[PDB]
Amino acid sequence: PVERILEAELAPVTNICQAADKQLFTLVEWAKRIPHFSELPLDDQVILLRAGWNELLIASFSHRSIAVKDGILLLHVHRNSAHSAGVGAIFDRVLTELVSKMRDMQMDKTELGCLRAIVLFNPDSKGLSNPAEVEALREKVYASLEAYCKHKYPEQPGRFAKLLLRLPALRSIGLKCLEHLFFFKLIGDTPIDTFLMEML
Amino acid sequence: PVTNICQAADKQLFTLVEWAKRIPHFSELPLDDQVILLRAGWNELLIASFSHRSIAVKDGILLATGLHVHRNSAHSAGVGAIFDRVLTELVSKMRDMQMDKTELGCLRAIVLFNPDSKGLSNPAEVEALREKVYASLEAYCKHKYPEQPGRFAKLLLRLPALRSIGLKCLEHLFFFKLIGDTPIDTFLMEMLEAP
Amino acid sequence: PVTNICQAADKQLFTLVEWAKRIPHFSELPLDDQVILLRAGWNELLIASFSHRSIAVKDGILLGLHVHRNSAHSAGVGAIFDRVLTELVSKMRDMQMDKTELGCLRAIVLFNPDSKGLSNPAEVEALREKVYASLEAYCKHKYPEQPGRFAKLLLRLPALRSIGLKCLEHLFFFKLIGDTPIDTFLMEMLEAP
Amino acid sequence: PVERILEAELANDPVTNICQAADKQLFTLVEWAKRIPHFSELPLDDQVILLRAGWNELLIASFSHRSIAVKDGILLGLHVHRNSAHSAGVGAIFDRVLTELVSKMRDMQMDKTELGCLRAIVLFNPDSKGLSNPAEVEALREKVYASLEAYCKHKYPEQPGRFAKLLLRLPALRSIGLKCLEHLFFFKLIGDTPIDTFLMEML
Numbered sequence: 145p146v147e148r149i150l151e152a153e154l155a156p157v158t159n160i161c162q163a164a165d166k167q168l169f170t171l172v173e174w175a176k177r178i179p180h181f182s183e184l185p186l187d188d189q190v191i192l193l194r195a196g197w198n199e200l201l202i203a204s205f206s207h208r209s210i211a212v213k214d215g216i217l218l219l220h221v222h223r224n225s226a227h228s229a230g231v232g233a234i235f236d237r238v239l240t241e242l243v244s245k246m247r248d249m250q251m252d253k254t255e256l257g258c259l260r261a262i263v264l265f266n267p268d269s270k271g272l273s274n275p276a277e278v279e280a281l282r283e284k285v286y287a288s289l290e291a292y293c294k295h296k297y298p299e300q301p302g303r304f305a306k307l308l309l310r311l312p313a314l315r316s317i318g319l320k321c322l323e324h325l326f327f328f329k330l331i332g333d334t335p336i337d338t339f340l341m342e343m344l
Numbered sequence: 345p346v347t348n349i350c351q352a353a354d355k356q357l358f359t360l361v362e363w364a365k366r367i368p369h370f371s372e373l374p375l376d377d378q379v380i381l382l383r384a385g386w387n388e389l390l391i392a393s394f395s396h397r398s399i400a401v402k403d404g405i406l407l408a409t410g411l412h413v414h415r416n417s418a419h420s421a422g423v424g425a426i427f428d429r430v431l432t433e434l435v436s437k438m439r440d441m442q443m444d445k446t447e448l449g450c451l452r453a454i455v456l457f458n459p460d461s462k463g464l465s466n467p468a469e470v471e472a473l474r475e476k477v478y479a480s481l482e483a484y485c486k487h488k489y490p491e492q493p494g495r496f497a498k499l500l501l502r503l504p505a506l507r508s509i510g511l512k513c514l515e516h517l518f519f520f521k522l523i524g525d526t527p528i529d530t531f532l533m534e535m536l537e538a539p
Numbered sequence: 540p541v542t543n544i545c546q547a548a549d550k551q552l553f554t555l556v557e558w559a560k561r562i563p564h565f566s567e568l569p570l571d572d573q574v575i576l577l578r579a580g581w582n583e584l585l586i587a588s589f590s591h592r593s594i595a596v597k598d599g600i601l602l603g604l605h606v607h608r609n610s611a612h613s614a615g616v617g618a619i620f621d622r623v624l625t626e627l628v629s630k631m632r633d634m635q636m637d638k639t640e641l642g643c644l645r646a647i648v649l650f651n652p653d654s655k656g657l658s659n660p661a662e663v664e665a666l667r668e669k670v671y672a673s674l675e676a677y678c679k680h681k682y683p684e685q686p687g688r689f690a691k692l693l694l695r696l697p698a699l700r701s702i703g704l705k706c707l708e709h710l711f712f713f714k715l716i717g718d719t720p721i722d723t724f725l726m727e728m729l730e731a732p
Numbered sequence: 733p734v735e736r737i738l739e740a741e742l743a744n745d746p747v748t749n750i751c752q753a754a755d756k757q758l759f760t761l762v763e764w765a766k767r768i769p770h771f772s773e774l775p776l777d778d779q780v781i782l783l784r785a786g787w788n789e790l791l792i793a794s795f796s797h798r799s800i801a802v803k804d805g806i807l808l809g810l811h812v813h814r815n816s817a818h819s820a821g822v823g824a825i826f827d828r829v830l831t832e833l834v835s836k837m838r839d840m841q842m843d844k845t846e847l848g849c850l851r852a853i854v855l856f857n858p859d860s861k862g863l864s865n866p867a868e869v870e871a872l873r874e875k876v877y878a879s880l881e882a883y884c885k886h887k888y889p890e891q892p893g894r895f896a897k898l899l900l901r902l903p904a905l906r907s908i909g910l911k912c913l914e915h916l917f918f919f920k921l922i923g924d925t926p927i928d929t930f931l932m933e934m935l
């Protein structure tokens with residue numbers, strides 16, 4: 145189904161942990177509204193969210209950032225701020241490889257939902273009790289996305305593959321965001337500097 | 345053994361360039377861009393090749409020299425994790441769906457034609473050639489495996505795995521730790537016992 | 540469990556600022572430079588503290604929560620943990636590194652003139668010279684029988700640097716304590732309405 | 733004395749050619765190590781471990797020091813300007829070599845005896861994994877840095893802090909060390925254009 149994925153998509157310094165907690169929770173609420181996700185073992189649900197949270201978050205804010213130049217919306221962080229916090233390279237990749245590609249092809253929210261659902265339903269995730277079941281749910285999602293794309297954009301016969309071929313970029317940007325601690329430098333950066341200037 | 349590795353590398357790079365030149369329209373790109381695509385691509389292209397070659401082998405990979413490497417050796421050289429990912433995420437997935445050599449070729453051609461490669465003079469042209477390749481692959485899949493309507497997507501969805509395994513092979517120096525470990529010890533000793 | 544870690548971090552950062560301000564001449568640096576030194580230094584400063592605390596423990600580190608190397612190897616960070624033990628904790632034990640000597644090393648680490656963005660690196664270098672001049676005085680007087688003790692102290696800093704970067708790169712702290720707390724978090728979220 | 737350390741210090745197919753350059757460089761490094769007192773008296777297993785543990789920092793220390801006689805470049809005989817380094821995608825690491833090592837060595841006029849002794853300290857690293865007798869390596873490192881302090885106190889008595897200043901370049905050497913591994917710094921520098929030149933065998 146493609147209607148419940150779009151429906152899902154539409155619906156003290158270190159205590160940066162609170163902001164993180166709230167962000168992760170938004171992500172869990174979304175996952176629970178993806179058909180069949182909540183019918184997986186609880187251990188498997190946790191593994192998929194642990195495996196997925198980084199790429200899922202980047203996909204969200206990348207897409208939000210379509211409405212913005214040389215920035216991402218969380219609110220608004222300009223690329224000059226990102227370069228200043230020593231994560232310029234990774235930020236520019238988000239812009240060129242994700243945000244602009246999403247803009248150029250006017251990726252809609254149903255299509256974002258389905259990609260995120262493919263990422264979430266990752267049968268490669270380590271420790272999954274039944275990877276075959278996860279694979280099966282991902283097949284349902286991308287079968288459903290192809291149906292949606294063929295109907296809404298029949299003039300764009302390549303559109304389905306183009307969507308799927310943004311996932312490799314998402315994966316590498318994924319790993320670079322972990323490795324550079326991208327999320328926690330973005331929200332945590334100045335709050336820390338501001339805290340520390342309690343040496344005044 | 346060290347001289348073998350360096351020759352094998354040279355031969356592999358050469359094989360890789362000859363292959364790329366025989367991909368339609370590749371040689372019609374700017375020369376700067378051809379170099380960028382091969383330099384951006386050689387890691388994933390090589391892993392795709394040997395992963396697929398390794399379909400015909402249990403708990404191992406075959407390298408295009410002939411050199412079979414079992415996972416026992418890989419875990420012994422302290423790259424067990426990365427080796428197991430190659431096996432589970434690539435080799436077995438390729439086996440399970442019986443990925444044929446046409447389908448490997450088209451994926452390698454998609455990887456080669458990477459319009460995200462840094463410094464490309466005309467990314468739009470590279471993107472255009474990748475569209476031709478994956479349009480051609482979908483045609484092939486729909487006709488040879490009409491019973492498997494999801495086969496095209498399944499092929500494309502091995503590329504993220506290839507990307508991460510790609511970066512992990514760089515980051516761990518996967519190739520050099522596999523074959524190069526004791527050859528280096530042997531090298532250094534030869535140098536140490538020389539005058 | 541997660542809430543506790545985040546509080547402990549906040550408390551650690553605070554302890555760290557109070558400490559730095561009580562280092563002579565630190566507070567006489569530009570505010571921009573003070574922030575840079577603490578941001579550049581917090582990782583090595585913390586590892587130096589808990590490494591030294593862990594002298595009183597076998598095959599473990601003390602952070603109140605004792606962490607045994609069996610748990611560390613089980614959480615896939617055995618390599619980094621063993622480096623902390625062999626290169627820092629045991630070396631500190633073997634030479635009976637005292638708390639004055641730890642303080643001076645931490646002060647040398649803090650006064651890092653290599654820190655990027657420093658307005659006046661020459662001033663930071665000058666304060667580090669004062670610190671390590673002071674440490675040599677201390678070493679030569681308390682351990683005159685150990686004429687190489689000063690150099691030995693300074694030659695633990697490279698280890699501190701590499702273990703520093705390896706702890707960042709592996710997310711050493713988060714994988715140690717944060718593993719199951721995260722699983723527990725996500726379940727809390729999953730069984731919420 | 734520390735004369736033997738200074739004496740030590742004052743001595744188509746694109747991948748194959750990089751490998752030859754590497755081979756030659758590593759060999760110069762072994763010849764140097766053999767002329768360090770007591771090194772050749774270690775077990776052969778231990779000698780191999782120290783060179784395996786050490787080669788990256790030892791090489792960087794050499795070329796950093798050689799590069800004192802050069803602006804916004806490093807000397808390997810092939811001078812490499814920072815423009816080329818930034819072009820080969822290793823600009824960050826190159827700038828660190830310049831700021832943290834080359835300029836610091838220039839500013840304090842580090843001489844070749846002092847470089848030798850630091851390299852000898854790096855070589856005699858008792859933290860190296862698998863050493864048969866790390867106590868012996870530690871003992872040789874103590875001899876080296878005891879000898880360096882003697883040299884510094886005599887040649888630069890006006891600079892009482894010069895010994896510590898020398899030793900406190902080693903952390904920088906370590907981090908630049910790990911960054912050079914992680915980026916494959918050496919092989920991108922020497923291997924860079926040879927590859928580009930090879931590949932431009934498209935016609």
Ligand SMILES: Cc1cc2c(cc1-c1cc3cc(C(=O)O)c(=O)oc3cc1O)C(C)(C)CCC2(C)C
Pocket residue numbers: 420421422517520521525784785786787788913
């Ligand atoms: C020991 C060692 C050193 C290095 C490297 C790797 C190792 C290295 C050596 C062994 C030997 C081994 C052996 O003695 O059989 C082993 O099992 O695992 C190793 C793992 C390693 O990472 C790389 C490839 C990262 C290049 C940089 C240097 C420092 C030369």
